[PDB]
Amino acid sequence: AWLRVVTLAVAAFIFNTTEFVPVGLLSDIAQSFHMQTAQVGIMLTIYAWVVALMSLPFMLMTSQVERRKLLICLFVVFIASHVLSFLSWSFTVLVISRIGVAFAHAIFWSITASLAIAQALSLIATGTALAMVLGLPLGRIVGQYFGWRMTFFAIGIGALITLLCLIKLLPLPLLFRRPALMSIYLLTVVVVTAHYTAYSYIEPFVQNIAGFSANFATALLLLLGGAGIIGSVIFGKLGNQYASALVSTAIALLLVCLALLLPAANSEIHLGVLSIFWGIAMMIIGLGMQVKVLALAPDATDVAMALFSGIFNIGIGAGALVGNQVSLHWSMSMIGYVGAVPAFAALIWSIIIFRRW
Ligand SMILES: CCCCCCCCCO[C@@H]1O[C@H](CO)[C@@H](O)[C@H](O)[C@H]1O
Numbered sequence: 001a002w003l004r005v006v007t008l009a010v011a012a013f014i015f016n017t018t019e020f021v022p023v024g025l026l027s028d029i030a031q032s033f034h035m036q037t038a039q040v041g042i043m044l045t046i047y048a049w050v051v052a053l054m055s056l057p058f059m060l061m062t063s064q065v066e067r068r069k070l071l072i073c074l075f076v077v078f079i080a081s082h083v084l085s086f087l088s089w090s091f092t093v094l095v096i097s098r099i100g101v102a103f104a105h106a107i108f109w110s111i112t113a114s115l116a117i118a119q120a121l122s123l124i125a126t127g128t129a130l131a132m133v134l135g136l137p138l139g140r141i142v143g144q145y146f147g148w149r150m151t152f153f154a155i156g157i158g159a160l161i162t163l164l165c166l167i168k169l170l171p172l173p174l175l176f177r178r179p180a181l182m183s184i185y186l187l188t189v190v191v192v193t194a195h196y197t198a199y200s201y202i203e204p205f206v207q208n209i210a211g212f213s214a215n216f217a218t219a220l221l222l223l224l225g226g227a228g229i230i231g232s233v234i235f236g237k238l239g240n241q242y243a244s245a246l247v248s249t250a251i252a253l254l255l256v257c258l259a260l261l262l263p264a265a266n267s268e269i270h271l272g273v274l275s276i277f278w279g280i281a282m283m284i285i286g287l288g289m290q291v292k293v294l295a296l297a298p299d300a301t302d303v304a305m306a307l308f309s310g311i312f313n314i315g316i317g318a319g320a321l322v323g324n325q326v327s328l329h330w331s332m333s334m335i336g337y338v339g340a341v342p343a344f345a346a347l348i349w350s351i352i353i354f355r356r357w
């Protein structure tokens with residue numbers, strides 16, 4: 001009935017939760033491995049960049065496989081990797097485990113984007129919604145109380161319990177040429193990097209760079225959650241029209257918040273509002289892209305979305321890596337400004353292609 005989709009929604013919740021979660025566990029993991037909080041962002045780069053390389057191949061090579069059998073194996077790789085993430089003894093192994101999840105993710109996102117056949121985005125994006133506001137926060141909380149490995153194991157078990165309802169299912173190019181969208185692919189990579197230079201380390205920035213608490217951090221990851229929620233629902237209303245404007249402004253705003261990271265770093269209420277805008281910004285620039293890809297590739301959407309998935313993660317890992325370099329070579333404070341550079345260019349490029357198309 002509904003329940004064959006509802007279970008899938010929870011699956012949507014849980015796979016995003018693990019993706020986000022290590023953004024507010026970097027310090028718990030740092031303590032454990034004896035490496036600076038910035039040094040562990042490789043595990044974000046590797047995750048994304050591995051899910052970048054394989055995203056097309058994997059969903060492609062598995063196109064033959066019936067959906068129930070598919071999701072099963074998929075979820076087995078996930079659950080096992082998490083056990084290994086919990087067991088992990090070297091940061092090498094931790095990242096080996098992350099790669100294990102990467103593969104699971106790679107496959108997954110395109111299967112459900114196919115299995116999504118605004119009644120799918122409704123039940124799925126509620127999963128992804130809840131994956132932000134509960135997932136990462138509680139994820140952060142459990143890491144504080146029970147240690148990160150335990151957090152990972154938790155997910156691991158969660159994936160198992162969701163699976164037995166998934167075991168109650170029945171058995172089931174020219175795009176490069178098209179330069180309307182390859183433009184949109186470009187804007188995506190550029191803009192994402194902007195966000196993920198700063199955001200990826202919003203914890204070590206909050207604690208180490210700014211006068212603030214570990215609980216203030218955990219407060220902020222919630223605040224970017226709801227801002228994400230607000231953002232999503234702002235995009236709900238005026239989404240079919242003005243969307244080009246709404247992305248361009250959202251990038252504009254994103255420019256703003258990045259540049260104003262240290263101007264806000266001393267006001268704990270400023271971060272509070274920075275995050276409310278920042279969060280709304282991203283969600284718009286996120287949802288403006290998806291929507292504009294679906295538009296610019298009705299033919300072979302899965303492939304469009306599969307490709308789109310991969311380039312976003314390129315941008316994540318790139319973001320994460322520059323964020324790592326700034327902190328490791330220069331200083332973690334300036335990730336704000338360094339972020340705002342791609343943010344500007346994207347805001348330029350956005351308006352260029354939007355006013356072009
Ligand atoms: C793994 C995901 C696939 C990447 C496609 C991203 C779209 C951006 C355009 O790609 C172009 O392709 C050239 C090939 O040589 C590169 O020189 C150059 O960087 C780039 O302008």
Ligand SMILES: CCCCCCCCCO[C@@H]1O[C@H](CO)[C@@H](O)[C@H](O)[C@H]1O
Nearest residue numbers: 186189190193318322342345346348349
């Ligand atoms: C200048 C007018 C035309 C704008 C065209 C889009 C601008 C793209 C900027 O390039 C980016 O520069 C970063 C430098 O660190 C790289 O990390 C990143 O991967 C790369 O893609």
